[model samples]
Target: MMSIAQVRSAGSAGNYYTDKDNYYVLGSMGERWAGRGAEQLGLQGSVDKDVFTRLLEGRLPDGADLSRMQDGSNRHRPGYDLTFSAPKSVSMMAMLGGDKRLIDAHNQAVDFAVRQVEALASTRVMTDGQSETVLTGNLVMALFNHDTSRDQEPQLHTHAVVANVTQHNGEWKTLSSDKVGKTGFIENVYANQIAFGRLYREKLKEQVEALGYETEVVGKHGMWEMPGVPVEAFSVDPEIKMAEWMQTLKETGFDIRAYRDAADQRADLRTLTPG
Candidate 1:
């Protein structure tokens, strides 16, 4: 099965454009777009910078206060990131095996998950303590596809970065914490993950079987796995090892760039060959 996590970065909007991890690849753009409920909206590259900022700040285009309501902090959340990922067996098939079908399947699964979240979790703006269901515009979503994990493992995933603002009655407002409060967001996220996993397996079960891999249900979540493939076949790369180590230092406070540079220097000196 897949897992979803929320990221709390101050300048995530800037990172979406300038960061190499999200925007460098042009191949994945075909699957990227934005949406409201069931309506499709066009995105400028990953997202329209103007829309992203407005949504992130929870303001209307005219700079009007979108959030008449207030949370305990009395501050809108900067933004929300929902990451959807698949099993390693599926990842290896999509990347190392060059299975375009699996890639397409993954994208489809993302779309399904996104729509589900919009329906089940996207906040309905309230007017005078009365909330409405229909939205004036689609949620500003920036879908990013990453082929590798922090460990540089072949992990196929997409980051659905949703701005915390949704439009209702011709104005923008902060997402309702009513449903998302007290683990509601967590529950919806897991539901989306599991729903996507089932869709992906159903979509590609035949093709995956043709690739000489047998599907097995593993874990308490009952996610699919390939028992025929051995994990040792794909050893961790040095760069990934350094990245994993860097994660440990983040909480303790260390110079990330300096550590990365030193790791790169050491990695460059090694004459390693794959079997």
Candidate 2:
């Protein structure tokens, strides 16, 4: 086993998670455990100092210096509970001339996204209520690197961390792993998500082109660096990537096995907390 001192001194190169957040790599299992509402959209907090504190103990007084972090479980509730109806308008009305037209259309779009999330969550809950339970957390839609030196392009990506358990009548709960699909919302959500992916692909392509660089989508280049840009190209599909994220979350809640493995192998600390 690696010692805490060794890992700490090794720094980010030895820390998988540190590197992930540093690079703003998208589509990881960590997203579910750390994601919260609008706040989660940014990469402010994900790792728990408590977890690391126990591992490092007297060795690490302030916890690992990964991103700007304070200590917490990083898990949160699901997105379904918070959505509410908002104002809406139609395109035709706006074109025809009406004060409410612009407002209505924007509200309508927001509602559409909200409904999309709602439908996705509810369906999952209803379908797999037995095994897979969805909880809310910080689902950050975007993150700023806090410095232009290690900038990310398009300047946005979603991150989420769920409570890893469900709620019942105002309480928290858990379920078996095999039953994740019991809610059955995944399929429909996937269909809708694929559509979203198609549209986003176009948008992302356009954005990159407008920025004077060409890459089909995020993840095209391992890192994006431009003549005067500070960020790596945005290479994550938050909308569609959520489905892939749900797979591992079903097995281990919020732990990223690969990342954890890398950290353990490369770092000095490796013990995990007991339940």
Candidate 3:
């Protein structure tokens, strides 16, 4: 699964780029630099915390500040928050089953999806009335991996903070799209985002299959899950879903294989519908 949110202020309590916990999630792996724009700025390998914070706030590494959007929006549009998540069964295995391969697979899929969207990195050159959109294909992101949902469920996800700065014609500018003139610029961005999520899931399912797991397409949006994962394990069932799941695991003597085998009968339980 995936989601998007806009970061209007850098270092805000909700900004993942600066949040202590999200930064911690990046862990020893450290921040990564993505997009050709990163290369334009000579940023690659490990990202520096202080430097990226400046970048996200629309300040380029070369000491030049990116200009504001031409739409008269005064808000500081630093970046878009792209959140990528692994499949339930995949997360179950990677997080609970402790499979390092699945962890790598999840991160790989996320990188793929981020690249897909980064290809759309664009900006309007001016408010000079001849609106031109340039596909800079340059983006900067601070990706952080989180291990659980808000309720502490066994979900694996990553947050990619795509900074709104792009390089064009030898200068840095804010990231924006003017493809849709009828208040449809946002619509264009969102449509591509939906496609990216589907692409992410499809890529993940393929790699997971390579790992010898059978996956079933589980949703209208091309989502998938392993049939072997116990449906009840998807939640604790309060029916706090996590509560039921934890207790069941306790009853199983913390034996995952036993719990899985016991889940073979799937006729009576309600479907774990993702709406």
Candidate 4:
């Protein structure tokens, strides 16, 4: 299954997106530009690369003025970010110069998962000191794909740079971090990820089965595995890494799996690759 991490920060847009490692992976996602009262367009459209930096620096986009929004609080936000990652084994199998269809399915699942989160979780706001779910908005998300972890191991992950400002009920406001930080949103992230994982696996099974490679189910959840390729062909041993991490946490009096799962839910980008 895939996982997500909520990393709310006031980082600069240019610093976050323009980082060589980051922007290189961003252009592939289709919707790259957006502005007030405008439909999503190409990367070279009116909402170009500069728009990201400008938003983080506390400015609205070109022609996206105060008049279009009631509060215009987006201009004052520090900044925001979110990160998502697939299981390392699955990511290695799909991304390590492997099947293009695997890549396509991964992209599709990512888009689906993010859209679900934005619509169901981030679309809320606090109005008159009251939480209101009746809000609409577009997020400036820079999606980055990476192939390795900080330890230089195969790890597939994405860093989504989400703008803090969003269009509310006829207004612009800083995203309500409370809403985004809630457990409900985290649950939604995992649910959508599970949906994507299942879909990706199903697609892979179909493609491999057609090739007539003997296959069988692995894992308690009945995941398909190609008998010709050893499991190690996918990636590093997860148990080794997990045990190492849990060792440190154990010294701090933490429930290993619980702490790890919660940390997984809040994972973020620490380097160009995974960390």
Candidate 5:
């Protein structure tokens, strides 16, 4: 599943999100540039810290204003942070199984979703004293990867720092939520999110299968897990009950089957803890 949040302060977004941001790396990679809007600005490869901070402030890398709203008011939000999270079993397999391929699948799905959201980028325009619509389908985004819950359990996710600026007709403007009257950004983006998320899940499943893993949908809204790996290992909140059970580690190393064999023995112990 995925979620969205607003970046109310430019400083906070730049500071908290641009560093490690509690994210895990795939090799030496941490954060990187994404979106066509970023290309328009000539941003490529790994993201630049100062340039990202400048964009969140609605300025170009050279410190030029992106729009009139840059210095407008304290009340305005500069951007949104969109989070795309992997399913629990997927995270566990990739982390404990030491299979980097699953991590690759998760990232590919998120990239597909980010592109879909960017396609929704737009801004309001004025035409003959009436508010109109223009397809300023550009987005400036910084992407980060994170692993582990606050509980320190395996949980994989990524963040997209979606800057509020978009360009049209050689000028930049803030992304608009107030459109003609129908569904605006609220209607357009939020309403279509389910399709986007479903598409992401579908992409993830496809890639995992390509890696020779068989998956079966286990829950409503298209949740799935690999069959050889017991679903209970994830559902049982294995932490509180399985810390002792973890002693069963396959001797060679961590193995999902060992954990699966331990799940039922500690089944009654799950009630001792609560979220």
Candidate 6:
């Protein structure tokens, strides 16, 4: 199958007007998932050639190509990022609740990080084709904010480690609404009034898109568009849950001393990729 290195080797078109960072990272934070076996890894790392081949024409192996999402030619640019924001900041300290808190918290932090990744991999974006592209097998990358904004906790952000490749085929394809559902992709901005204690989501949008990054604002409320979890699954009351997650961090062996100093009693973070 494919390795993290292999996918990056395919080359992204290059940084986009919209990308915050110059070059995208791969694996755990950028492209790879945590806490899965080799078989799962294998499936995740490779793009099904048959599924993507001639995808511009909206087709796949199942001959279920609906091509309803877009007209062909809507390809992923080099730095076409699917950026999303989380108002809840989950840290090492809140995830674990019992003894050996530090170690378990650390492990859980890593596990949760992996889950975000796995969730992303398992997640899907609307491809131009009518069929949904299985992204779990694709490589991924990630990043997290370090500072806090007022009352908000620190939140983590992620990116797909792999880039897309496939000449559009004009045939048919299959969609797996049965496959993992989509989320964590680029969309509208919303602020956790609890953190900023005001409406700053719209401002956040202006700043990012002004930087030349593409922005998609879905709606004002958090709701799962799909049957499983809504896009806003973790958006609400993230701080309360983050506190619980912090308990996990203690279990995993993460010292909160540095964190406390860093956060200064409130976790504030915004993903920034310097130019």
Query: Which model scores highest in TM-score?
Result: 5
Per residue, candidate 2 scores C-alpha lDDT tens digits across 1-275 of 00001122212212422334333222231221222232322224445434322322212222322221238322221111121111111111121112232233333333334333432332124554343445432122211111001222222222111112322343323211324354433344345654433333333333333323323222432222222221211224433333443343344333333333443353333233233
Tens-place lDDT digits, model 4, residues 1-275: 44454443334444444444432222233334332323332233333556555555445654444322338444344433445454443443443324344455555556655564466433455468776454353555655565446664545555555555566554555553444543333354465766645654555455434433234777744465544233353234444544453344345443333423332343322223463
- How much is 74 displaced in model 2, in angstroms? 18
Q: Which runs in model 1 stand beyond 4 Å of their true positions?
A: 16-18, 22-31, 37-54, 59-74, 122-138, 176-214, 235-275
Ranking by lDDT: 5, 3, 1, 4, 6, 2
Instruction: Report the Cα lDDT for candidate 6.
Output: 0.29
lDDT of 3 by residue, 215-255 (tens): 88878898778864754545622224444545665664455
Ranking by TM-score: 5, 3, 1, 4, 2, 6
The TM-score that candidate 4 achieves is 0.54
lDDT of 6 by residue, 1-275 (tens): 00121122112322221132321110122222222322222334323333222232333233444444346443322212223333232221222212122222223333343333333333344557653444443222222212122344333333222222221232212212334434222210111212221123333334323322233434343211111111122333444545654554455554445444343322223334333
- In candidate 3, stretches whose alpha carbon ends up further than 4 angstroms from where it belongs are 13-30, 67-75, 126-128, 177-187, 236-275
For model 3, what is the alpha-carbon lDDT of residue 113? Answer: 88
Better of 3 and 4 by TM-score: 3
Please report, as a residue range, the 10-residue window in candidate 2 with the lowest summed lDDT: 1-10
List RMSD in Å for every model shown.
12.0, 22.1, 8.0, 13.4, 9.3, 17.7
Error of 4 at 56 (Å): 3.1
Better of 3 and 5 by TM-score: 5
Any idea how many clashes model 6 has?
81
TM-scores, all models, native as reference: 0.61, 0.28, 0.76, 0.54, 0.78, 0.24
Q: What lDDT score is found at residue 254 in candidate 4?
A: 30
lDDT of each: 0.54, 0.28, 0.66, 0.46, 0.69, 0.29
For candidate 5, give the lDDT. 0.69
- 134-165 in candidate 5: lDDT tens per residue? 66678888887776555555567777888878
